Amino acid sequence: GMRCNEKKKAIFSNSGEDTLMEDHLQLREKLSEDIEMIKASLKNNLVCSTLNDNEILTLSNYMQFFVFKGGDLVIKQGEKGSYFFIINSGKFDVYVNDKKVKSMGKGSSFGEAALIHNTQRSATIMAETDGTLWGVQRSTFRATLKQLSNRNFNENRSFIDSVSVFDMLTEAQKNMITNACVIQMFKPGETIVKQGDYGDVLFILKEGKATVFINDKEIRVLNKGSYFGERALLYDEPRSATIIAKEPTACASICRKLLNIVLGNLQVVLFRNIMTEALQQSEIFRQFSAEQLNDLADTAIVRDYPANYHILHKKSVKYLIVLEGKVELFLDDESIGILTRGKSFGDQYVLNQKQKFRHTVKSLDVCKIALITESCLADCLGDNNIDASIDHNNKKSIIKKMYIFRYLSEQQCNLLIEAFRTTRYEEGDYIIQEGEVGSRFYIIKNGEVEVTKNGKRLRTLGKNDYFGERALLYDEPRTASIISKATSVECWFVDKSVFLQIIQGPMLTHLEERIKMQDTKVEMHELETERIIGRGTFGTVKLVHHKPTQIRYALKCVSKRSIISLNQQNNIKLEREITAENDHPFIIRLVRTFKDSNCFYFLTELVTGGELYDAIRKLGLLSKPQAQFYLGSIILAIEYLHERNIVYRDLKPENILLDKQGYVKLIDFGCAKKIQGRAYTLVGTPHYMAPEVILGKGYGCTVDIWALGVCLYEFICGPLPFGNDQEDQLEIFRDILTGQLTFPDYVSDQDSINLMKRLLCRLPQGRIGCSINGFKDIKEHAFFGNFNWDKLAGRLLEPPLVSKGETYAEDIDSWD
Amino acid sequence: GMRCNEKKKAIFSNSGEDTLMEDHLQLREKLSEDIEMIKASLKNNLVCSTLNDNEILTLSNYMQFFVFKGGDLVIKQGEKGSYFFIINSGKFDVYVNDKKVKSMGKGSSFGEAALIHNTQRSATIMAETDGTLWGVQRSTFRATLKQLSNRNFNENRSFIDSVSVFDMLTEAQKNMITNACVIQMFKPGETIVKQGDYGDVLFILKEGKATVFINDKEIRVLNKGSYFGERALLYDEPRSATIIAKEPTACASICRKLLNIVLGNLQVVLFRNIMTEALQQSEIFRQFSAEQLNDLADTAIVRDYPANYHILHKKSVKYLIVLEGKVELFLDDESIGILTRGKSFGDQYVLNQKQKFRHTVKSLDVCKIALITESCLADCLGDNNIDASIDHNNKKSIIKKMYIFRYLSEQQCNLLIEAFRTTRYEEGDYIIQEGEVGSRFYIIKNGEVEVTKNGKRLRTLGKNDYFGERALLYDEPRTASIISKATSVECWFVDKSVFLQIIQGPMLTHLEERIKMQDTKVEMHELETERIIGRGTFGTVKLVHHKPTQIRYALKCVSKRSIISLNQQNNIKLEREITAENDHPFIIRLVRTFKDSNCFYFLTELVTGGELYDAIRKLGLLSKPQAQFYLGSIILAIEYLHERNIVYRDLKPENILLDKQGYVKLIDFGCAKKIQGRAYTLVGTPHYMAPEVILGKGYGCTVDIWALGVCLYEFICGPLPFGNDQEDQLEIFRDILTGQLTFPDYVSDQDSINLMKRLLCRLPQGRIGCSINGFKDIKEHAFFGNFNWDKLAGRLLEPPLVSKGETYAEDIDSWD
């Protein structure tokens, strides 16, 4: 009887409030009177008041029946809060500080805070008689609101995808109008649209049927998926029919007024997408900015031609795009090809404005053409010298991709571009030699070069690649050779001397200090700690000193056990990702991280001007110029993150530091997330939290713009706008959701107010900065009318507060 | 606009499989065909086959509807398993190692292992067509089985509490027959009992109605709570009526056959409770053992008397108990009192068997009396010398409460008692003087004494208290004085010399070594570690050395992070409690614990003979004497724990060590729990786990007796009895639940087999050792027929294996 000599291990054991309710739970059929009472009760709830009948009915069916005897415990003070309760029968007594206060019966509600967030209870509800409770947990409640709003969104998106007039909207644009869909119920007999009405609404049947009439005579019936009113979004046209609902039926609907707010003029937007797609097939226009291309689209002459028409024959047309049909191109008598839908022609003439248009173009069928004239281009470029502007703008788009140049003012960036000189090299010429001290930066005009180090080759570089930019900031040996490996290579270049006549001290200091940070590979043992400069509860923030180079850093220490206990294993690596990739002047720059069996580490630049929380407190109520500066700065950082699909989620003055020059640095990305669709989790600081996070029906990047509203309000008015005196979170969220926004009598600037109201608009679609234009609407708001956004990023503005000496918050390797 | 200078902190973020299913979830009305398919599907499930129709219907309604499209993910390999699924429509394909295997449609089931326990998936189920799934999670499934069985139990207990014939059962006894209740459905017209039937079943109406007939003539109707058949449990009597159900109705029912198995003869048990309550009002019989009192109850002469009858008048009646009515006591012509129901008399005559009964007793009304004669007492005591036995047994019950004496053989304990001598002291006499070396142990016969140290007093001690027992084991100074603080105090005493002629080396060594352990207050810094002697994964087990005394210990180190990550904050303190209180020779003795910011610590005695797992492997198949010894030993440890309402829950040879003498020590109380009612959590080692833990309908201490069956099977037969080859847990639990128990042809002992079958009885009520007698049925089983339980606890048996030198498992301050 041989025995296994293996070893086999045992299974181990795993709310408290959720255990008690499980004892009282029973099944019950949901009568008419039950459904209507719950339905009435929820419409007085903080969260559920905005919900329509269909959504509340779904919630109702997820409620569970609970049965209690007299003198039985329901909820206790200081326990973790999970359930919300509607009393169905009997009486229930409320003990606060173990001393009776209230008495509740049928219709009454309690524990509404548990739905919003896991929260410590206030009272101890006790059962007097043999009474009963309808109840639901947080998890179930939040999950249910997620699925209702999420399915609503996805279904409406599919319907957007099957309406032909939206076919040429971009991904982002379709997602934005999906949110403008309003669901609209119809009973039998209700006319959905009437013949001859000048309606402006598109309808899409979700489920149901509807009869179509023309001049009171039935024509057909419409089934689930059918739609009507496309043309009503583009033009003022009477309805071609009377459509009447046969059975109970549900429509997803979009109105032109909301579309125009969210999207702008739909024709204008569609055409820009079409033109931008066409123009970007050319290597010339692919180097234009989106704004330039949109202006070409807005100003293009569009013409319909019959077949066999000579559209061009050797005005001042430089470029031609086929919108519809087909044309044939000819050089003298030789056809050179046929252009179909979306193809275009004219690169040669766009590049040489003085050149005689030699080709001819002949329609093969009835066609629609867009034409770009010379003056159309010049308006777009702001300059009659087309060839020079195009060249200038080619150089501009190369350097605006590099950290060193992309934040310089426009005037500085232009001067620098104009200072470029050109040299030609023979093959085998050493453009740069490893070990020598450089004074030049290079952009490749023509041909190819080879990057080498001590003989061994590293890579190859070609047209419009750049190299040697460090020579502009430091005097140091070149760490590689750049060898001309083609016939007659041409480079653009700029001398360090010219660069220093253009860039002014503060930006130069910022750049000098910043680019150095990657040079120095830091090891933990090379760091000594000077002092503590912060204390996050999670761990510590030590001010550290790198002995070899004497550069000073901040080291954030983050205990393993604090991460493990809260189930933040998933979240800490997502933070490291976001933190590592951030490369903006007003956002903290990570240097590297370190691993350890006891605690994680973030090594970041040291910021020496203290928190913004304390700066506004030194300044008092900020004037317009001071609020422009700080809000401006925050706007650029936030906009940078939204461009990368990152919602910050915790914007507040505490999370912004000031550097030595008085310019801001956003820190603390613990709440930040890469936004893949709609977010639902409840994260952030209550006073700064947007109502859509609280209401649990989906949010996006828009939440950070609401927070921006809160910040401007504190800056200009002083107190927070909602729940300024409140400790109790429930009451904070109540003021956020339903409180009145007011402004004190000492706020004398109508534009500041206008701006604060529109940033603090409760519905995201009404909120400035949340439409198709994004932050442009904010930046161009009259509040910023006198404010030079250009000089902000380029450190050319006198900031509100420059710290005398250093100031810290003192008295106040894969991660797995 | 002053600002709050507080700080406000942010809210943070918190299955994976549970997130996906939430997307596919929809509402659906449960039709007849749905309910019957689910109902059919569950009756083929490993867990749900034993469940009756009402229980399965409750499960059915908790199932949720899920809707999928073609090529959508349901379950993935290597993910954490939560749901069980019944396919309602369409086809579903099963990928193992990412390579297709099976095809499933309507009626088919998958993921049944997820219900039992959180487990890693085997396949990836994928949706081919637009098919649908009925599904339920583990949490919901386990919670639902908890509530059904728990409410069933509580309701049946209340009904037990309202049946008069059970009024005199103890708490424990009522709880045991509650489990014998069988629920029995009746339709309209079905006769529940028939007039003249010799039925043996008690019925209790839960909900419903039923008509009573005598001689075919209606008498009354019965309502919810009404019951009938009390007398059928006690006697063979025809039913007095025909009771027929009017409406659909549900009965809780107890049968005499099951009662007799669970409880024994109900009359006999009731009477013992009544007699034991009465007899214990006397200070004499309160010193008797439960067995002695039960024998007095079983043999008492019971008589009914008319009023005004002289029951006693100056046979050999020594004691008298009034069962019914009232009697008056008289000394000659003076009444000395009236004895009502449950009162008794005769202390004077019980203590002096030769004394002439001088009182007389006169019934005041019709009465029932129990009488205890002299020979009744003598049979109970095993001795004609009543006064001497009573005295002997008074001494016995004093010493059997002390560790030092309570495990000695009976013959040794008797000899020692017989060796007691008596001295008398004057007041102010120093019975013991602090600082002197003692040779005596003392029990106080009469009067009081005072414990003092250096003048300051500590406590007072009186009749039948004891002191100075350490003088029996060590030669050392007395740490306190014992001063006679009453007139003419009398002590019993025994000399060390006499004690050493009775107790033999092995027990003496055990006692010497054990009692020392409390003397030495250990501090962490006084410990140096010699080596590692174990590695639990949770942490380490170091062999440590106390420098001052040179005593050697085991130190178990338990990392904080291992506790925090698994949510074992609740459980580690419950373990420390249980571990600290254990004070049995065959269970590991804790010395103390220590706290630390990095890891918890258990300091325990060092055990040097290695695990039992390895010992049976050296021995091979154990003979009868060797299996008796180890199983015997385990039985005493387990019985000790059950007496303290502790279920061990992880009994297996790995959790038992052998000491230097070859006697066992149960270790590792991580799975152990103080059992407050029925337990539900799934804990332990699969191969040792009892079917009632697996089936999720409640368990108790009985689980450890099933495990004992597993152990005996490995000892005698060799392999495990269920799932001996299986790694896959699902298949282990399947063999436990429905597998056939077989025994190899080389097992030649019919009693061993009999025992193994009854320990491995699947239903707890059929399992030996789980009835009212507890372990007595096991200890008296013919398997143990030649085995001296007395010598086991007293270390008077040659054990199976004595280790040559030490052997470890080497190559193989409130806690918050």
Ligand SMILES: Nc1ncnc2c1ncn2[C@@H]1O[C@H](COP(=O)(O)OP(=O)(O)NP(=O)(O)O)[C@@H](O)[C@H]1O
């Ligand atoms: N690079 C830095 N330079 C200077 N001070 C810093 C730097 N990083 C962090 N600090 C300071 O350290 C504090 C704590 O850092 P932070 O990442 O916000 O921690 P936390 O866990 O989110 N808790 P909290 O203190 O409420 O913000 C900050 O508020 C700053 O005052």
Ligand SMILES: Nc1ncnc2c1ncn2[C@@H]1O[C@H](COP(=O)(O)OP(=O)(O)NP(=O)(O)O)[C@@H](O)[C@H]1O
């Ligand atoms: N007092 C002791 N004397 C000698 N060996 C001991 C002692 N305590 C523990 N050990 C050994 O250390 C091992 C680990 O202890 P244990 O408490 O069972 O840890 P665990 O976390 O449950 N894991 P496991 O090793 O599977 O049992 C035991 O199996 C013994 O071999």
Ligand SMILES: [Cl-]
């Ligand atoms: Cl897009």
Ligand SMILES: [Cl-]
């Ligand atoms: Cl036009």
Ligand SMILES: [Cl-]
């Ligand atoms: Cl150079």
Ligand SMILES: [Cl-]
């Ligand atoms: Cl009891």
Ligand SMILES: [Cl-]
């Ligand atoms: Cl009798």
Ligand SMILES: [Cl-]
């Ligand atoms: Cl003594």
Ligand code: NA
């Ligand atoms: Na912060």
Ligand code: NA
């Ligand atoms: Na163990």
